[PDB]
Amino acid sequence: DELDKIDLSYETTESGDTAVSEDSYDKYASNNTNKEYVCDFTDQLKPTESGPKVKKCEVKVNEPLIKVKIICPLKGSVEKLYDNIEYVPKKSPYVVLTKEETKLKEKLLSKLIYGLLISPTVNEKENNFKEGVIEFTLPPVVHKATVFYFICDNSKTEDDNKKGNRGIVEVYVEPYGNKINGCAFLEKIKMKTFFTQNIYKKNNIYPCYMKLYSGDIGGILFPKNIKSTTCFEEMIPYNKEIKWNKENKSLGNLVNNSVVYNKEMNAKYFNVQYVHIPTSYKDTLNLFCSIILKESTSYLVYVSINEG
């Protein structure tokens, strides 16, 4: 592809071309709102006489499934304040930067954290600084601490005696979680080390069967030759838990205040879907769903919540 092509010769630093030391950095916290960690640079990179200063957005991750939002105003958002702005890496958040020694070089995030969702469109518009903002939703588990950076530099812009600043976002991920209460339909290891059950194509015995409780999370790694899936769009119960509505089959229509991620499977790197159980859901429920194949050869999946 071209949206993830990395320049192996690229190099840069935190201070960039400002000669500033890490101590003089203006480190601040992200405005987090309902599992959404935010780094807004609109009112932070405005030129100042005392510039070019360096503002650092700290992002500390010790929890799962944080929707990350990063802002880097566009050239001309204000008439003259961002006339010479630069955001790096260009093809973000597909491409990111990691600290090799003291300098930085390009790295692919999907190749660094498996199971991360990067919807190519935010508010109907592309997911790139060209449209002014970038988003991405984290995975539910991480094995090793991962640190990468973003860049949003307005220092090259000047408003008479004032000068813009160099914006940077540091993401210090801490090891959280262990595995997924889900199934794995089958470089390649991170597929196997993330689920409790593995489902092989040629000869499978047990179908998918993911067990859940109140406040736990599960997921699925859908196959490579998938035709369709109904495991969060159309759920069906069996035996006798509750009288069934033939239309309230979407996971959102089944449990109030439930969550689904990548319901449309539009993510670029992986064909995956996730869910979350609110801490207020104390009702027991057991459901079923199916999956399709290109061949119709279908697999099945089971769901159990608070089954105790």
Curated annotation (Swiss-Prot):
It is found in: Cell surface; Cell membrane. Disulfide bonds join C39-C57, C72-C152, C183-C208, C231-C289. May be processed into a 310 kDa form as the parasite emerges from the host erythrocytes. Residues 35-176, 179-307 form the 6-Cys domain. Promising transmission-blocking vaccine candidate: targeting the protein would prevents transmission of the parasite decreasing the malaria burden. The LMIV230-01 transmission-blocking antibody against the 6-Cys domain 1 also binds to the heterologous P.falciparum Malian isolate 20-2217-0 which carries a 'Ser-605' polymorphism and to the heterologous St Lucia strain which carries 'Ser-605' and 'Asn-661' polymorphisms. Glycans are attached at N31, N248, N256. Gametocyte surface protein required for male/female gamete fusion. Also required for male gamete exflagellation and interaction with host erythrocytes. Heterodimer; heterodimerizes with PF45/48. This is Gametocyte surface protein P230. It comes from Plasmodium falciparum (isolate 3D7). The chain holds residues 555 to 886 of 3135 of the full protein.
